[PDB]
């Protein structure tokens, strides 16, 4: 029951001269159009985030889409902006990255799979560098690359654990020099973070060239620019920089563009998409990955300053189940009423509301209702929110579309304002200081400790002039802390930083706590088993 | 200075309902349209091939395009069908896969780069199988796959020698089991060959199911269908099965679809594209890879039988320089007149003409003129052709477009006829007899010798019931023989078969002579170094 993309484009007054179709239901918009609009006024920006994620699933993306649909429903022109999902995970398990129920972005199969080929473009560019690096070494290694100190990995958009740790370059002289390597899932690529952060092609190429590839035999930094390949990568990314226009279940507009990780990167869609939506609608609904401790913090302290914007409100997605989980309930019994676990778990919601207010944002709690939620449960969460002084609306967008999101849309429209920016750190505070602030203010730690490895990394960072970059914290999303086992609202603990690295092209330092999974595996019975093209030539099993 | 795809599509009277645009200048045509046209009349099919390829470059693709343009020009409705170029090679070296000069397919950057994503789709399907295979093993290996007897490789569309020989599955229990592996360039995938041979989605899926993945602990064949992923692979290929519509320099139609190798596979575009062109034009001009000993032979003995068609003429592309090279001339002096090397090299042309005649085809020689060519040279070639009893036209399409191709067009239109099919072998002659025939008739060997490895391979083939499959010979293209050293027209030599394998989904046995390079490397100074996006945001350095 879908609108041709030209219809959607018309709603937004987009002309064909800047529209590049992909079939009848998708188009790219020329990114250069954004600069054209530079004298046009920006609308409101609504940041969608969530309580600490649980295995019960909180449906944030579904809620984002539903909010936008509901804003349009109440007569306020709105665009939802989303990350493009990785293909890999879908071949493993059905996921929620294109929403659910009556609150989806469409056409779902295409979005979930090849879409407009942006993931393939990133992989190509990324892998080209790797190929060129090895070939440089093969042909005489003029740059004196130390093959034990290559930071740059290969990539594929596939959930393939077999490629986590490999040995390449075997078979003899004609094949070059043996070394150890790894594949990461393509979304985790610094190329993807860069694509999401670039305003234009010049910006993109400059960023690509800055990427740190390796150390040489004298421990000097080798950059992409030293290989001279940044131009070719840019060419491979020339269409990928243009955001993708699609639609919601209800025929309202959506922009889907880029998919950086929300741990080792900033975890939101491209600044190009967000900025363009802001010129084209009254309410831009944009989400950030993981809980408000990760996605939302990164959105304010980093993305917003790159992008030259600031949210007018934050929506905190919560569920009764998630709160019971955070209160100590078993996942296996989560569908059963438990008002004591609920009361205790509410502390997690409280920390996120408080943290959000540290950024001076008005907050609206979106309580995603499940079938099994009791009225006592819903009533309690609502009352507790009222006592916090936070707007709250119950959301039923999965079941009802915008008819399930009216109260939420009105709360958001009522809450949104122009706020005085309140960043946690100055763009150029020392890395250690930024970390201390984040750990204190957001993760609610009593202190930070750096491992010896991290200490050595900090020395490297200072030596090479990166001590003033913004910091992107890569920690577990399962806790406000660094410890994935700590449910609820841990406080006053010792936050441990295990390591750090520099993403010089993206323009940030990553502070790591524990091991980060950059290449997820396949389950024993993968979703691919369900996938097919039926007798009628329709795709089944994907979404 | 070129035409909106709608204008090309209108030329062929295609409706929007089976057209999927990719930007303003490309469209996919729904493949199911071909079945619609089944009661419609086939036009003529012109097979374009060439003399034994030399490093001097013969410009076969440019000529194929030129010929189609010239036919249109002389009032005969024509479509050119071409393979899609692999990205990988272009990042290493500018090539000729989109033609040259005033005889190209456009838009050429897009065609040479990501195009409509078909390469990516093939790679995804291919790699999915590899990921699932390793994960099956990790999770209990119920199929008892022998990890020393896995035939299936990984793939990327990149010239990466570092990936020719690798070790995967390292790092411990969580990552699964170590094993040896390889990457092959995507073009070389059996999935690519299958895509190019399939008539519809049921066919595709059946074919994929039959692919031999590995042997188990008991030396039993393990097939894709055993893993149950053929449906997911079909899903990933659902758009890739649809041919791509573009145009020539002169705004005439071109279909570009698939890109199998001409050594380990059949070396031409998809049967869907050739078949469709034949319903939509008077003259379908279709190219086959490498010299007439490989691409042309396979086109007649194999592709034609799968496609249910047969050419009406063969065009044999030749150059003065190639002939001199074959007569022993130095590449460095190739520009220098040398009627004696020319006389000697003509023998290569003679063999290909005689061989084409074996298939009962009328032949036209396309003498692709170079600037350095003396009149005395053009004249000698033309006389020698006349004596040989073969039509010959000098072609200047590169320089002059359509204009420079009119003589070739007229000659082709004059020569084309309905012929009695004359295949070299019967579809179910034993593999060894098929090879004997090819070696004798085409490669002009005096006998065939099978290595011990080949003999063992034959035992396998017969054991598992593949002994009556068609045979695709993977040998050097640089000689009519198996020996790349042997220029001109070697005869009476001993043709060596090194090994054999089974492409069960594609439906053929491959017979190998020597090592076949299925993962080319990058040169010391790759073409990537030239690639860029210029201040005006235009791509440079690709073509």
mmCIF file with all atom_site columns, N, CA and C in Angstrom, chain B residues 460-501:
data_model
loop_
_atom_site.group_PDB
_atom_site.id
_atom_site.type_symbol
_atom_site.label_atom_id
_atom_site.label_alt_id
_atom_site.label_comp_id
_atom_site.label_asym_id
_atom_site.label_entity_id
_atom_site.label_seq_id
_atom_site.pdbx_PDB_ins_code
_atom_site.Cartn_x
_atom_site.Cartn_y
_atom_site.Cartn_z
_atom_site.occupancy
_atom_site.B_iso_or_equiv
_atom_site.pdbx_formal_charge
_atom_site.auth_seq_id
_atom_site.auth_comp_id
_atom_site.auth_asym_id
_atom_site.auth_atom_id
_atom_site.pdbx_PDB_model_num
ATOM 1   N N  . UNK B 1 460 ? 36.765 -39.150 -9.975  1.00 0.00 ? 460 UNK B N  1
ATOM 2   C CA . UNK B 1 460 ? 35.763 -38.508 -9.088  1.00 0.00 ? 460 UNK B CA 1
ATOM 3   C C  . UNK B 1 460 ? 34.510 -38.156 -9.883  1.00 0.00 ? 460 UNK B C  1
ATOM 4   N N  . UNK B 1 461 ? 34.782 -37.522 -11.004 1.00 0.00 ? 461 UNK B N  1
ATOM 5   C CA . UNK B 1 461 ? 33.743 -37.074 -11.947 1.00 0.00 ? 461 UNK B CA 1
ATOM 6   C C  . UNK B 1 461 ? 32.832 -38.228 -12.362 1.00 0.00 ? 461 UNK B C  1
ATOM 7   N N  . UNK B 1 462 ? 33.439 -39.375 -12.644 1.00 0.00 ? 462 UNK B N  1
ATOM 8   C CA . UNK B 1 462 ? 32.669 -40.527 -13.147 1.00 0.00 ? 462 UNK B CA 1
ATOM 9   C C  . UNK B 1 462 ? 31.930 -41.145 -11.974 1.00 0.00 ? 462 UNK B C  1
ATOM 10  N N  . UNK B 1 463 ? 32.611 -41.185 -10.842 1.00 0.00 ? 463 UNK B N  1
ATOM 11  C CA . UNK B 1 463 ? 32.023 -41.766 -9.622  1.00 0.00 ? 463 UNK B CA 1
ATOM 12  C C  . UNK B 1 463 ? 30.683 -41.100 -9.275  1.00 0.00 ? 463 UNK B C  1
ATOM 13  N N  . UNK B 1 464 ? 30.641 -39.772 -9.431  1.00 0.00 ? 464 UNK B N  1
ATOM 14  C CA . UNK B 1 464 ? 29.532 -38.933 -8.905  1.00 0.00 ? 464 UNK B CA 1
ATOM 15  C C  . UNK B 1 464 ? 28.599 -38.493 -10.020 1.00 0.00 ? 464 UNK B C  1
ATOM 16  N N  . UNK B 1 465 ? 28.838 -39.075 -11.182 1.00 0.00 ? 465 UNK B N  1
ATOM 17  C CA . UNK B 1 465 ? 27.878 -39.020 -12.258 1.00 0.00 ? 465 UNK B CA 1
ATOM 18  C C  . UNK B 1 465 ? 27.894 -37.755 -13.087 1.00 0.00 ? 465 UNK B C  1
ATOM 19  N N  . UNK B 1 466 ? 29.056 -37.113 -13.144 1.00 0.00 ? 466 UNK B N  1
ATOM 20  C CA . UNK B 1 466 ? 29.208 -35.836 -13.858 1.00 0.00 ? 466 UNK B CA 1
ATOM 21  C C  . UNK B 1 466 ? 29.931 -35.989 -15.191 1.00 0.00 ? 466 UNK B C  1
ATOM 22  N N  . UNK B 1 467 ? 30.082 -37.244 -15.615 1.00 0.00 ? 467 UNK B N  1
ATOM 23  C CA . UNK B 1 467 ? 30.940 -37.586 -16.775 1.00 0.00 ? 467 UNK B CA 1
ATOM 24  C C  . UNK B 1 467 ? 30.360 -37.171 -18.118 1.00 0.00 ? 467 UNK B C  1
ATOM 25  N N  . UNK B 1 468 ? 29.101 -36.743 -18.118 1.00 0.00 ? 468 UNK B N  1
ATOM 26  C CA . UNK B 1 468 ? 28.426 -36.336 -19.354 1.00 0.00 ? 468 UNK B CA 1
ATOM 27  C C  . UNK B 1 468 ? 28.124 -34.857 -19.396 1.00 0.00 ? 468 UNK B C  1
ATOM 28  N N  . UNK B 1 469 ? 28.615 -34.136 -18.397 1.00 0.00 ? 469 UNK B N  1
ATOM 29  C CA . UNK B 1 469 ? 28.453 -32.682 -18.391 1.00 0.00 ? 469 UNK B CA 1
ATOM 30  C C  . UNK B 1 469 ? 29.237 -32.060 -19.524 1.00 0.00 ? 469 UNK B C  1
ATOM 31  N N  . UNK B 1 470 ? 28.774 -30.912 -20.007 1.00 0.00 ? 470 UNK B N  1
ATOM 32  C CA . UNK B 1 470 ? 29.572 -30.082 -20.897 1.00 0.00 ? 470 UNK B CA 1
ATOM 33  C C  . UNK B 1 470 ? 30.915 -29.689 -20.258 1.00 0.00 ? 470 UNK B C  1
ATOM 34  N N  . UNK B 1 471 ? 31.874 -29.335 -21.096 1.00 0.00 ? 471 UNK B N  1
ATOM 35  C CA . UNK B 1 471 ? 33.226 -29.029 -20.642 1.00 0.00 ? 471 UNK B CA 1
ATOM 36  C C  . UNK B 1 471 ? 33.651 -27.658 -21.038 1.00 0.00 ? 471 UNK B C  1
ATOM 37  N N  . UNK B 1 472 ? 34.105 -26.957 -19.993 1.00 0.00 ? 472 UNK B N  1
ATOM 38  C CA . UNK B 1 472 ? 34.611 -25.595 -20.060 1.00 0.00 ? 472 UNK B CA 1
ATOM 39  C C  . UNK B 1 472 ? 36.103 -25.653 -19.798 1.00 0.00 ? 472 UNK B C  1
ATOM 40  N N  . UNK B 1 473 ? 36.884 -25.346 -20.811 1.00 0.00 ? 473 UNK B N  1
ATOM 41  C CA . UNK B 1 473 ? 38.354 -25.423 -20.742 1.00 0.00 ? 473 UNK B CA 1
ATOM 42  C C  . UNK B 1 473 ? 38.968 -24.125 -20.238 1.00 0.00 ? 473 UNK B C  1
ATOM 43  N N  . UNK B 1 474 ? 39.682 -24.228 -19.119 1.00 0.00 ? 474 UNK B N  1
ATOM 44  C CA . UNK B 1 474 ? 40.393 -23.108 -18.535 1.00 0.00 ? 474 UNK B CA 1
ATOM 45  C C  . UNK B 1 474 ? 41.894 -23.256 -18.824 1.00 0.00 ? 474 UNK B C  1
ATOM 46  N N  . UNK B 1 475 ? 42.322 -22.526 -19.829 1.00 0.00 ? 475 UNK B N  1
ATOM 47  C CA . UNK B 1 475 ? 43.693 -22.525 -20.252 1.00 0.00 ? 475 UNK B CA 1
ATOM 48  C C  . UNK B 1 475 ? 44.032 -21.107 -20.550 1.00 0.00 ? 475 UNK B C  1
ATOM 49  N N  . UNK B 1 476 ? 45.314 -20.894 -20.800 1.00 0.00 ? 476 UNK B N  1
ATOM 50  C CA . UNK B 1 476 ? 45.821 -19.572 -21.186 1.00 0.00 ? 476 UNK B CA 1
ATOM 51  C C  . UNK B 1 476 ? 45.059 -19.028 -22.385 1.00 0.00 ? 476 UNK B C  1
ATOM 52  N N  . UNK B 1 477 ? 44.781 -17.701 -22.419 1.00 0.00 ? 477 UNK B N  1
ATOM 53  C CA . UNK B 1 477 ? 44.177 -17.128 -23.619 1.00 0.00 ? 477 UNK B CA 1
ATOM 54  C C  . UNK B 1 477 ? 45.201 -16.587 -24.616 1.00 0.00 ? 477 UNK B C  1
ATOM 55  N N  . UNK B 1 478 ? 46.458 -16.664 -24.196 1.00 0.00 ? 478 UNK B N  1
ATOM 56  C CA . UNK B 1 478 ? 47.571 -16.021 -24.880 1.00 0.00 ? 478 UNK B CA 1
ATOM 57  C C  . UNK B 1 478 ? 48.125 -16.869 -26.030 1.00 0.00 ? 478 UNK B C  1
ATOM 58  N N  . UNK B 1 479 ? 47.618 -18.085 -26.112 1.00 0.00 ? 479 UNK B N  1
ATOM 59  C CA . UNK B 1 479 ? 47.995 -19.068 -27.161 1.00 0.00 ? 479 UNK B CA 1
ATOM 60  C C  . UNK B 1 479 ? 46.736 -19.805 -27.606 1.00 0.00 ? 479 UNK B C  1
ATOM 61  N N  . UNK B 1 480 ? 46.756 -20.409 -28.796 1.00 0.00 ? 480 UNK B N  1
ATOM 62  C CA . UNK B 1 480 ? 45.676 -21.323 -29.175 1.00 0.00 ? 480 UNK B CA 1
ATOM 63  C C  . UNK B 1 480 ? 45.893 -22.607 -28.405 1.00 0.00 ? 480 UNK B C  1
ATOM 64  N N  . UNK B 1 481 ? 47.142 -22.792 -27.962 1.00 0.00 ? 481 UNK B N  1
ATOM 65  C CA . UNK B 1 481 ? 47.515 -23.955 -27.140 1.00 0.00 ? 481 UNK B CA 1
ATOM 66  C C  . UNK B 1 481 ? 47.343 -23.707 -25.635 1.00 0.00 ? 481 UNK B C  1
ATOM 67  N N  . UNK B 1 482 ? 47.875 -24.652 -24.859 1.00 0.00 ? 482 UNK B N  1
ATOM 68  C CA . UNK B 1 482 ? 47.849 -24.616 -23.388 1.00 0.00 ? 482 UNK B CA 1
ATOM 69  C C  . UNK B 1 482 ? 49.071 -23.877 -22.869 1.00 0.00 ? 482 UNK B C  1
ATOM 70  N N  . UNK B 1 483 ? 49.940 -23.537 -23.795 1.00 0.00 ? 483 UNK B N  1
ATOM 71  C CA . UNK B 1 483 ? 51.253 -22.953 -23.496 1.00 0.00 ? 483 UNK B CA 1
ATOM 72  C C  . UNK B 1 483 ? 51.330 -21.485 -23.892 1.00 0.00 ? 483 UNK B C  1
ATOM 73  N N  . UNK B 1 484 ? 51.384 -20.588 -22.890 1.00 0.00 ? 484 UNK B N  1
ATOM 74  C CA . UNK B 1 484 ? 51.306 -19.139 -23.148 1.00 0.00 ? 484 UNK B CA 1
ATOM 75  C C  . UNK B 1 484 ? 52.462 -18.640 -23.998 1.00 0.00 ? 484 UNK B C  1
ATOM 76  N N  . UNK B 1 485 ? 53.501 -19.471 -24.071 1.00 0.00 ? 485 UNK B N  1
ATOM 77  C CA . UNK B 1 485 ? 54.753 -19.115 -24.779 1.00 0.00 ? 485 UNK B CA 1
ATOM 78  C C  . UNK B 1 485 ? 54.542 -19.243 -26.263 1.00 0.00 ? 485 UNK B C  1
ATOM 79  N N  . UNK B 1 486 ? 53.596 -20.096 -26.637 1.00 0.00 ? 486 UNK B N  1
ATOM 80  C CA . UNK B 1 486 ? 53.456 -20.451 -28.060 1.00 0.00 ? 486 UNK B CA 1
ATOM 81  C C  . UNK B 1 486 ? 52.567 -19.476 -28.810 1.00 0.00 ? 486 UNK B C  1
ATOM 82  N N  . UNK B 1 487 ? 53.186 -18.491 -29.459 1.00 0.00 ? 487 UNK B N  1
ATOM 83  C CA . UNK B 1 487 ? 52.408 -17.563 -30.298 1.00 0.00 ? 487 UNK B CA 1
ATOM 84  C C  . UNK B 1 487 ? 52.073 -18.201 -31.615 1.00 0.00 ? 487 UNK B C  1
ATOM 85  N N  . UNK B 1 488 ? 51.287 -17.453 -32.366 1.00 0.00 ? 488 UNK B N  1
ATOM 86  C CA . UNK B 1 488 ? 50.869 -17.842 -33.713 1.00 0.00 ? 488 UNK B CA 1
ATOM 87  C C  . UNK B 1 488 ? 49.894 -18.998 -33.756 1.00 0.00 ? 488 UNK B C  1
ATOM 88  N N  . UNK B 1 489 ? 50.307 -20.053 -34.465 1.00 0.00 ? 489 UNK B N  1
ATOM 89  C CA . UNK B 1 489 ? 49.448 -21.210 -34.746 1.00 0.00 ? 489 UNK B CA 1
ATOM 90  C C  . UNK B 1 489 ? 50.135 -22.547 -34.508 1.00 0.00 ? 489 UNK B C  1
ATOM 91  N N  . UNK B 1 490 ? 50.492 -22.847 -33.250 1.00 0.00 ? 490 UNK B N  1
ATOM 92  C CA . UNK B 1 490 ? 51.060 -24.162 -32.918 1.00 0.00 ? 490 UNK B CA 1
ATOM 93  C C  . UNK B 1 490 ? 50.117 -25.308 -33.245 1.00 0.00 ? 490 UNK B C  1
ATOM 94  N N  . UNK B 1 491 ? 50.682 -26.404 -33.757 1.00 0.00 ? 491 UNK B N  1
ATOM 95  C CA . UNK B 1 491 ? 49.904 -27.621 -34.053 1.00 0.00 ? 491 UNK B CA 1
ATOM 96  C C  . UNK B 1 491 ? 50.696 -28.881 -33.797 1.00 0.00 ? 491 UNK B C  1
ATOM 97  N N  . UNK B 1 492 ? 49.970 -29.949 -33.542 1.00 0.00 ? 492 UNK B N  1
ATOM 98  C CA . UNK B 1 492 ? 50.549 -31.297 -33.419 1.00 0.00 ? 492 UNK B CA 1
ATOM 99  C C  . UNK B 1 492 ? 51.202 -31.542 -32.086 1.00 0.00 ? 492 UNK B C  1
ATOM 100 N N  . UNK B 1 493 ? 51.247 -30.483 -31.288 1.00 0.00 ? 493 UNK B N  1
ATOM 101 C CA . UNK B 1 493 ? 51.757 -30.574 -29.897 1.00 0.00 ? 493 UNK B CA 1
ATOM 102 C C  . UNK B 1 493 ? 50.845 -31.390 -28.970 1.00 0.00 ? 493 UNK B C  1
ATOM 103 N N  . UNK B 1 494 ? 51.401 -31.674 -27.808 1.00 0.00 ? 494 UNK B N  1
ATOM 104 C CA . UNK B 1 494 ? 50.692 -32.406 -26.759 1.00 0.00 ? 494 UNK B CA 1
ATOM 105 C C  . UNK B 1 494 ? 50.058 -31.414 -25.784 1.00 0.00 ? 494 UNK B C  1
ATOM 106 N N  . UNK B 1 495 ? 48.736 -31.460 -25.785 1.00 0.00 ? 495 UNK B N  1
ATOM 107 C CA . UNK B 1 495 ? 47.916 -30.615 -24.917 1.00 0.00 ? 495 UNK B CA 1
ATOM 108 C C  . UNK B 1 495 ? 47.795 -31.270 -23.539 1.00 0.00 ? 495 UNK B C  1
ATOM 109 N N  . UNK B 1 496 ? 48.226 -30.551 -22.514 1.00 0.00 ? 496 UNK B N  1
ATOM 110 C CA . UNK B 1 496 ? 48.186 -31.094 -21.154 1.00 0.00 ? 496 UNK B CA 1
ATOM 111 C C  . UNK B 1 496 ? 47.016 -30.566 -20.309 1.00 0.00 ? 496 UNK B C  1
ATOM 112 N N  . UNK B 1 497 ? 46.308 -31.514 -19.713 1.00 0.00 ? 497 UNK B N  1
ATOM 113 C CA . UNK B 1 497 ? 45.274 -31.268 -18.718 1.00 0.00 ? 497 UNK B CA 1
ATOM 114 C C  . UNK B 1 497 ? 45.839 -31.635 -17.366 1.00 0.00 ? 497 UNK B C  1
ATOM 115 N N  . UNK B 1 498 ? 45.827 -30.611 -16.527 1.00 0.00 ? 498 UNK B N  1
ATOM 116 C CA . UNK B 1 498 ? 46.436 -30.558 -15.194 1.00 0.00 ? 498 UNK B CA 1
ATOM 117 C C  . UNK B 1 498 ? 45.551 -31.091 -14.096 1.00 0.00 ? 498 UNK B C  1
ATOM 118 N N  . UNK B 1 499 ? 44.295 -30.699 -14.204 1.00 0.00 ? 499 UNK B N  1
ATOM 119 C CA . UNK B 1 499 ? 43.285 -30.998 -13.193 1.00 0.00 ? 499 UNK B CA 1
ATOM 120 C C  . UNK B 1 499 ? 41.897 -30.783 -13.757 1.00 0.00 ? 499 UNK B C  1
ATOM 121 N N  . UNK B 1 500 ? 40.916 -31.202 -12.990 1.00 0.00 ? 500 UNK B N  1
ATOM 122 C CA . UNK B 1 500 ? 39.518 -30.957 -13.332 1.00 0.00 ? 500 UNK B CA 1
ATOM 123 C C  . UNK B 1 500 ? 38.674 -30.719 -12.091 1.00 0.00 ? 500 UNK B C  1
ATOM 124 N N  . UNK B 1 501 ? 37.629 -29.934 -12.268 1.00 0.00 ? 501 UNK B N  1
ATOM 125 C CA . UNK B 1 501 ? 36.587 -29.858 -11.260 1.00 0.00 ? 501 UNK B CA 1
ATOM 126 C C  . UNK B 1 501 ? 35.190 -29.680 -11.805 1.00 0.00 ? 501 UNK B C  1
#
